[PDB]
Amino acid sequence: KYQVELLEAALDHNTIVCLNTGSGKTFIAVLLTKELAHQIRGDLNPHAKRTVFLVNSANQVAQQVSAVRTHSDLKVGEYSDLEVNASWTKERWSQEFTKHQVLIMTCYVALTVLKNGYLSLSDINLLVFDECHLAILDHPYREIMKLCESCPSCPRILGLTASILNGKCDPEELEEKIQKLERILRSDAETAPCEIVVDCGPFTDRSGLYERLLMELEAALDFSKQILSDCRAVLVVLGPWCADKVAGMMVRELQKYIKHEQEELHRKFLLFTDTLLRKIHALCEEYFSPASLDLKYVTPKVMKLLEILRKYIIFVERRYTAVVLNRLIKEAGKQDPELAYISSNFITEFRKQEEVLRKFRAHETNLLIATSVVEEGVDIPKCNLVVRFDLPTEYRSYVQSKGRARAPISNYVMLADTDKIKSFEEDLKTYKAIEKILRNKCSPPYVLRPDDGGPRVTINTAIGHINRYCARLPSDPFTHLAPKCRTRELPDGTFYSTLYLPINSPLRASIVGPPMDSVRLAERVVALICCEKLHKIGELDEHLMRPGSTKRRQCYPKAIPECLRESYPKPDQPCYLYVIGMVLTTPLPDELNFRRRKLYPPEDTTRCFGILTAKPIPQIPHFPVYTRSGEVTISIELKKSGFTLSQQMLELITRLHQYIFSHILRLEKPALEFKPTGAESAYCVLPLNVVLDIDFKFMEDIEKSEARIGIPSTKYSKETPFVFKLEDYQDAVIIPRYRNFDQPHRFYVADVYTDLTPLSKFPSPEYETFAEYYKTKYNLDLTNLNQPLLDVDHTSSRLNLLTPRLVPELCAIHPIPASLWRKAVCLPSILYRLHCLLTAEELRAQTASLGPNPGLILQALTLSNASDGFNLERLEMLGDSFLKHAITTYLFCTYPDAHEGRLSYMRSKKVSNCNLYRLGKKKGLPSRMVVSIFDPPVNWLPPGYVVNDLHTEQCIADKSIADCVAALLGCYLTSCGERAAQLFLCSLGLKVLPAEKTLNHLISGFETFEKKINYRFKNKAYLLQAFTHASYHYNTITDCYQRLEFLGDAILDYLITKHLYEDPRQHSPGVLTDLRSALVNNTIFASLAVKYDYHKYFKAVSPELFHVIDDFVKFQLEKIEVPKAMGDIFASLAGAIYMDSGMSLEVVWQVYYPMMQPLIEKFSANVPRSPVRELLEMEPETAKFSPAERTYDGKVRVTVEVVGKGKFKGVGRSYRIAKSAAARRALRSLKANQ
């Protein structure tokens, strides 16, 4: 919290902050400017003050301009050209001063204006001196400050500097420097592990090879030069084997550089340099095995390293040193097996640069070797053992380095030679003095219930309890929640403390306590009061603190509606008659009439079928059956009622009813056995002939017939031969008497080929006439050889009509006509759809007791597996959106005291697929679903037929029940409305229904954003609620925006899915899912937030977040980490517009549609394929994804293996995100390789 406290102090009093890099300079500059922006902005000349950023030179005057223009709405004037501003005059100076709020100008032009006298220091409020250290010398800044000293009222000077604390005599010089700076700037000064000197003993080679190396190296100096320097350094460090490895790499690369050399003279000098370098290459006689050592010739530095490793970040100077060190580390790990903790790695055109990034990603290796450039710019993980072969030549290096050793029991060791230790001691003592002076300049145990209650508390652990409560609150990696307090020193000596808890906790009040004499007592008593209030308001506790999966499958009973049970017409009870009306409303297009045969209209037939239903059945909608003639609109309509029948009449009815499904359609599977009185359903189907009437005479005509079962006998003789009575075959169904015995195949009479006769030509070459064909193949002694023959056509074998896809005397005539035959072949689909529609009507009225249409409920009950014309996907999407919306709104309006973490947990458990499965099962939904494909011979069960399982049971997965519940919710939302959907959710059992001035100068500056988005808030507190962050501790009126984010995201997901659903283009499920994932992505939200200037009004104190937002905003202006916070504020502002508009959605969609419009238009013109689906479709067999791999840091890793092409890995906060990243990486590689 050092940076935050520096900002607090800067806000309290004049401060000379001492940043270590310019990034922090610009950060504290813009941040304080925004804090005082309320004092800056104005509309009246005397009531308006301006900030001036005096810059040293003319080059640094654009970086601050950019920073303030980007991260703030303030307009920034720049006056950098010295001569051109010297040519200016009194008139325009005031003009420009009024034309800008933030002025950035050179010290020369600064003193120039001052002497002229146009802008007074009284009107300036923030005077930020860049590089203010120059005020010790005769820089203009001294005159400007002296003039300020001559002014009674002076701005809040914030000297900014980075050239302090870098001197050699700092123990005194730095003291006098700060003293002088404070005496001139008239301001204060504020700025923002143990040392183990390690002694290294001497070591020398017995043979003296080392001195020989110096000798030959020195001789070369007498007489390219770059490699000479490199060699000496590496050789000095250690044993000759690694040195020779480095020398080998040098010679290898030099043999190439010589060839690449451009100067022949240098080429010659470099060849002589090879002649010099090969001395090491030849000296191999002076040393022994490099793979069979015994630590006899190693360098003592490595000996010390090895001893330290055995007992248990290494900053290096030259690359070769790091390389050899890493090499010998693994070598010793192999040589000695007791170094179990040994695990090394090393660090230091564009191609090589890319590798460094991957090497950094392997930072989990405990021992990370690196060069001296690792001291700044990297957020190296926590290390417990820092080994430094060298010593810090510079104070800032010592400080920055020793900082990294952040371990509860840390060891910051520093290797030094025995003689050098004196110098190291002196230097570190000087540095210690420097750091000391710098830091100096900156500087009744409760019990719930004595009998049991909770463990015995102690006074010294209360603050610990409050600190772990602050740690248990939620936060992101860019924020840090810690308690605040200020000892209220009193002249009496008894001072109290006031705990300001984090901005996310419910206790937004000052938890003051009584005053005590000592700090410890005060702190522990205030922590005690805090624990009390927290356990009282409902935070602390007495302790002082698979279903729904696709794999699960079961077989449920089918649901024959409760309107067809025991409805068998009885003689002593009234009965209802219902005609099955049929009309052909869509004849086949002739272009598609590949059969080239005319159509038979069913409506033009006096004879039809009806249902004699005893118990009345609720009306259902007319539906279409696709027949050979096209589409027939079926409709069950009432004709008569209140008529009884005789016992023998009902017997006739039953025998004919079984005849229809046992001899005509051949739906008598051996598994079944007729049982009207015994079945679940027992209604009867009877013909109806316009006289409508049952036409009992027709039934008796078809019953007395001697052809009922099996072809009868014919009448072909010599005295009374057969005759061609064309009237008897004008509308007939024929049964060949010469083939298919015992299993006849029936045909129609398409026409009569009067032009063709038994003696006429025969199509097959084997015979010349039909008479010959019979006489030869079947040996049929036809008693007549002259007659007109009959054209034929087959009788449709197919019975799933739900969706689109001959010699007279030798064949008998079926008693029933062909029109009734086709009308009967249409029957099974009719009965199946009747069953389904009635089940839907029941599931409609049971929940309604107005309501949704039974056909749309049927669409909600049909899974995709059925391959029917209807499917579940679209309703699923919409319903899931609604569900999330509803749950979130309810949890946010009913539990105002819980934080986003608990709300998220509860919501994710209520909307989980297991809960929806349980809810659906409670309502019996799995018994009402059409999963199977219609196949009447296999899965159907005709009326009045029992099985004496595929018929009665069905297999459904729990996820399908969840899908069904969501789809019914979608149906109710798309038909009845939102209130109906809400009450249906509560019907399944999901209870989804039942400072003034601080605000003024905190909201000030949003009067332009309100205009940009064309919305003015009623209660301005919602703006602050949205544009806040968990680190904006200066905001005490409202809490953090995370709870608003929670509701906002759900609102924008429902709005976008609703818009995509009600689009005339009627996108398919895949397109809908893809667009949903594309528009509901955080990255897109951040892109839009940055585009519409949301970043200008955000408010957070985290510096890292500031830098990330800077990168992302610049990137979006030109057109890589996307800051989640920007998309989060986008969602939060959506939630705020929803909460401030009296709980309305239209307001949100009229404030956000003008922004998201272009994106949806583009993505609907070119749907972006999902990267995961695209990779699975591009490489379904070779691309395989590993299961979720949890990383040590808590993230999720995913590996994808493309067999024969490579392996790719991804990391993300979730499996889906990591999988998407892995798939994108593979696709980009595959597409680049292809």
mmCIF file of N, CA and C in Angstrom, residues 674-721:
data_model
loop_
_atom_site.group_PDB
_atom_site.id
_atom_site.type_symbol
_atom_site.label_atom_id
_atom_site.label_comp_id
_atom_site.label_asym_id
_atom_site.label_seq_id
_atom_site.Cartn_x
_atom_site.Cartn_y
_atom_site.Cartn_z
ATOM 1 N N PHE A 674 -54.293 -58.134 -29.026
ATOM 2 C CA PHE A 674 -55.467 -57.282 -28.879
ATOM 3 C C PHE A 674 -56.072 -57.426 -27.489
ATOM 4 N N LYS A 675 -56.449 -56.291 -26.904
ATOM 5 C CA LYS A 675 -56.974 -56.212 -25.547
ATOM 6 C C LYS A 675 -57.568 -54.821 -25.342
ATOM 7 N N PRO A 676 -58.750 -54.529 -25.901
ATOM 8 C CA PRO A 676 -59.368 -53.216 -25.659
ATOM 9 C C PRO A 676 -59.592 -52.963 -24.177
ATOM 10 N N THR A 677 -60.380 -53.837 -23.545
ATOM 11 C CA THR A 677 -60.681 -53.696 -22.126
ATOM 12 C C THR A 677 -59.436 -53.774 -21.247
ATOM 13 N N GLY A 678 -58.325 -54.291 -21.770
ATOM 14 C CA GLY A 678 -57.124 -54.500 -20.985
ATOM 15 C C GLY A 678 -56.032 -53.463 -21.165
ATOM 16 N N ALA A 679 -56.156 -52.586 -22.158
ATOM 17 C CA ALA A 679 -55.068 -51.680 -22.492
ATOM 18 C C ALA A 679 -55.151 -50.397 -21.668
ATOM 19 N N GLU A 680 -54.119 -49.560 -21.808
ATOM 20 C CA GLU A 680 -54.150 -48.226 -21.217
ATOM 21 C C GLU A 680 -55.169 -47.332 -21.917
ATOM 22 N N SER A 681 -55.179 -47.343 -23.250
ATOM 23 C CA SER A 681 -56.155 -46.616 -24.048
ATOM 24 C C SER A 681 -56.984 -47.602 -24.858
ATOM 25 N N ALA A 682 -58.253 -47.242 -25.105
ATOM 26 C CA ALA A 682 -59.164 -48.164 -25.774
ATOM 27 C C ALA A 682 -60.185 -47.462 -26.668
ATOM 28 N N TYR A 683 -59.871 -46.279 -27.191
ATOM 29 C CA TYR A 683 -60.815 -45.643 -28.100
ATOM 30 C C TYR A 683 -60.892 -46.441 -29.401
ATOM 31 N N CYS A 684 -61.979 -46.233 -30.144
ATOM 32 C CA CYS A 684 -62.229 -46.947 -31.390
ATOM 33 C C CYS A 684 -62.264 -45.999 -32.580
ATOM 34 N N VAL A 685 -61.785 -46.504 -33.717
ATOM 35 C CA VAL A 685 -61.715 -45.766 -34.975
ATOM 36 C C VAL A 685 -62.673 -46.433 -35.953
ATOM 37 N N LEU A 686 -63.577 -45.648 -36.535
ATOM 38 C CA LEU A 686 -64.606 -46.172 -37.422
ATOM 39 C C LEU A 686 -64.775 -45.299 -38.657
ATOM 40 N N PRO A 687 -65.118 -45.893 -39.802
ATOM 41 C CA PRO A 687 -65.360 -45.091 -41.005
ATOM 42 C C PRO A 687 -66.612 -44.243 -40.872
ATOM 43 N N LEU A 688 -66.682 -43.207 -41.707
ATOM 44 C CA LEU A 688 -67.826 -42.302 -41.726
ATOM 45 C C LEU A 688 -68.165 -41.987 -43.173
ATOM 46 N N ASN A 689 -69.369 -42.370 -43.593
ATOM 47 C CA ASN A 689 -69.850 -42.163 -44.954
ATOM 48 C C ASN A 689 -71.006 -41.176 -44.945
ATOM 49 N N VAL A 690 -70.893 -40.121 -45.756
ATOM 50 C CA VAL A 690 -71.980 -39.159 -45.885
ATOM 51 C C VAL A 690 -73.230 -39.883 -46.360
ATOM 52 N N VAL A 691 -74.324 -39.715 -45.622
ATOM 53 C CA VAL A 691 -75.606 -40.316 -45.977
ATOM 54 C C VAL A 691 -76.566 -39.211 -46.401
ATOM 55 N N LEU A 692 -72.828 -37.097 -41.444
ATOM 56 C CA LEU A 692 -72.038 -38.320 -41.489
ATOM 57 C C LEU A 692 -72.658 -39.395 -40.608
ATOM 58 N N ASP A 693 -72.382 -40.653 -40.943
ATOM 59 C CA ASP A 693 -72.872 -41.790 -40.175
ATOM 60 C C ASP A 693 -71.824 -42.890 -40.209
ATOM 61 N N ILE A 694 -71.895 -43.781 -39.218
ATOM 62 C CA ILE A 694 -70.928 -44.868 -39.095
ATOM 63 C C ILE A 694 -70.939 -45.774 -40.324
ATOM 64 N N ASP A 695 -72.010 -45.751 -41.114
ATOM 65 C CA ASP A 695 -72.155 -46.606 -42.291
ATOM 66 C C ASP A 695 -71.971 -48.077 -41.919
ATOM 67 N N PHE A 696 -72.873 -48.543 -41.051
ATOM 68 C CA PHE A 696 -72.830 -49.927 -40.587
ATOM 69 C C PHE A 696 -72.945 -50.906 -41.748
ATOM 70 N N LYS A 697 -73.708 -50.535 -42.781
ATOM 71 C CA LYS A 697 -73.860 -51.393 -43.949
ATOM 72 C C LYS A 697 -72.513 -51.679 -44.596
ATOM 73 N N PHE A 698 -71.668 -50.655 -44.728
ATOM 74 C CA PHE A 698 -70.339 -50.869 -45.288
ATOM 75 C C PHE A 698 -69.538 -51.856 -44.446
ATOM 76 N N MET A 699 -69.600 -51.724 -43.118
ATOM 77 C CA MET A 699 -68.902 -52.669 -42.254
ATOM 78 C C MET A 699 -69.394 -54.092 -42.485
ATOM 79 N N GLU A 700 -70.707 -54.269 -42.634
ATOM 80 C CA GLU A 700 -71.219 -55.614 -42.871
ATOM 81 C C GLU A 700 -70.821 -56.125 -44.250
ATOM 82 N N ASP A 701 -70.763 -55.240 -45.245
ATOM 83 C CA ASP A 701 -70.310 -55.642 -46.572
ATOM 84 C C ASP A 701 -68.865 -56.117 -46.535
ATOM 85 N N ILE A 702 -68.016 -55.426 -45.770
ATOM 86 C CA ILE A 702 -66.615 -55.827 -45.649
ATOM 87 C C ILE A 702 -66.436 -56.998 -44.698
ATOM 88 N N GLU A 703 -67.472 -57.361 -43.941
ATOM 89 C CA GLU A 703 -67.372 -58.481 -43.014
ATOM 90 C C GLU A 703 -67.863 -59.780 -43.643
ATOM 91 N N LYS A 704 -68.993 -59.744 -44.355
ATOM 92 C CA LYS A 704 -69.494 -60.941 -45.022
ATOM 93 C C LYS A 704 -68.573 -61.422 -46.137
ATOM 94 N N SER A 705 -67.685 -60.559 -46.631
ATOM 95 C CA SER A 705 -66.803 -60.915 -47.733
ATOM 96 C C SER A 705 -65.999 -62.169 -47.415
ATOM 97 N N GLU A 706 -65.851 -63.030 -48.420
ATOM 98 C CA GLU A 706 -65.108 -64.277 -48.292
ATOM 99 C C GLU A 706 -63.616 -64.106 -48.558
ATOM 100 N N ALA A 707 -63.155 -62.877 -48.784
ATOM 101 C CA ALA A 707 -61.750 -62.576 -49.024
ATOM 102 C C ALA A 707 -61.089 -61.911 -47.824
ATOM 103 N N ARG A 708 -61.815 -61.773 -46.706
ATOM 104 C CA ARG A 708 -61.316 -61.139 -45.487
ATOM 105 C C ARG A 708 -59.880 -61.531 -45.156
ATOM 106 N N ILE A 709 -59.593 -62.832 -45.160
ATOM 107 C CA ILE A 709 -58.269 -63.361 -44.844
ATOM 108 C C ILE A 709 -57.898 -64.374 -45.919
ATOM 109 N N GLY A 710 -56.906 -64.031 -46.739
ATOM 110 C CA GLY A 710 -56.458 -64.893 -47.817
ATOM 111 C C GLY A 710 -57.246 -64.737 -49.101
ATOM 112 N N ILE A 711 -56.534 -64.739 -50.225
ATOM 113 C CA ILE A 711 -57.123 -64.618 -51.557
ATOM 114 C C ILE A 711 -58.207 -65.677 -51.741
ATOM 115 N N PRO A 712 -59.406 -65.332 -52.250
ATOM 116 C CA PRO A 712 -60.441 -66.360 -52.429
ATOM 117 C C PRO A 712 -60.278 -67.111 -53.741
ATOM 118 N N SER A 713 -61.259 -67.936 -54.094
ATOM 119 C CA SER A 713 -61.226 -68.690 -55.338
ATOM 120 C C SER A 713 -61.792 -67.857 -56.482
ATOM 121 N N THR A 714 -61.227 -68.052 -57.669
ATOM 122 C CA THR A 714 -61.638 -67.339 -58.869
ATOM 123 C C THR A 714 -62.618 -68.181 -59.681
ATOM 124 N N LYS A 715 -63.143 -67.572 -60.753
ATOM 125 C CA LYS A 715 -64.133 -68.202 -61.634
ATOM 126 C C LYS A 715 -63.637 -68.089 -63.076
ATOM 127 N N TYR A 716 -62.726 -68.984 -63.453
ATOM 128 C CA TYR A 716 -62.170 -69.047 -64.802
ATOM 129 C C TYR A 716 -62.434 -70.443 -65.352
ATOM 130 N N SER A 717 -63.375 -70.547 -66.288
ATOM 131 C CA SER A 717 -63.734 -71.810 -66.918
ATOM 132 C C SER A 717 -63.812 -71.618 -68.429
ATOM 133 N N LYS A 718 -64.182 -72.694 -69.125
ATOM 134 C CA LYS A 718 -64.311 -72.672 -70.578
ATOM 135 C C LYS A 718 -65.693 -72.231 -71.038
ATOM 136 N N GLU A 719 -66.733 -72.519 -70.255
ATOM 137 C CA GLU A 719 -68.094 -72.130 -70.605
ATOM 138 C C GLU A 719 -68.468 -70.766 -70.044
ATOM 139 N N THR A 720 -67.900 -70.388 -68.901
ATOM 140 C CA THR A 720 -68.171 -69.102 -68.257
ATOM 141 C C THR A 720 -66.848 -68.467 -67.844
ATOM 142 N N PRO A 721 -65.968 -68.189 -68.807
ATOM 143 C CA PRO A 721 -64.668 -67.593 -68.478
ATOM 144 C C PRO A 721 -64.812 -66.230 -67.820
#
